[PDB]
């Protein structure tokens, strides 16, 4: 719930997440993220879409 509460609200799967967190989140397909982020898909996917853009941005930073 601690992860879901922040997910449904302000969980950062961009830079706030770690290696496995961003990974497991990267697998948080629209179907799961949807519920855990019970919002509009376009809206929940966007939060996830930003999360990925950061994943590689932070990965290429090194």
């Amino acid at each position: 719930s601690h992860i879901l509460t922040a997910l449904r609200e302000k969980q950062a799967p961009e830079l706030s997440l770690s290696s496995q967190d961003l990974e497991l989140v990267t697998k948080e397909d629209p179907k799961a993220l949807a519920v855990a982020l019970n919002w509009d898909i376009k809206k929940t996917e966007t939060v996830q879409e930003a999360c990925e853009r950061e994943l590689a941005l932070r990965l290429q930073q090194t």
Side-chain angles (χ1 to χ4, degrees), residues 9-42:
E9 240 258 329
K10 277 316 313 291
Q11 185 263 285
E14 24 266 349
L15 178 74
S16 196
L17 277 193
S18 196
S19 73
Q20 283 243 263
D21 237 333
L22 260 129
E23 239 246 80
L24 225 153
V25 106
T26 290
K27 245 174 200 231
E28 226 123 283
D29 284 65
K31 297 86 157 259
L33 57 81
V35 46
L37 296 83
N38 221 272
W39 326 319
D40 205 59
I41 179 151
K42 182 197 95 89

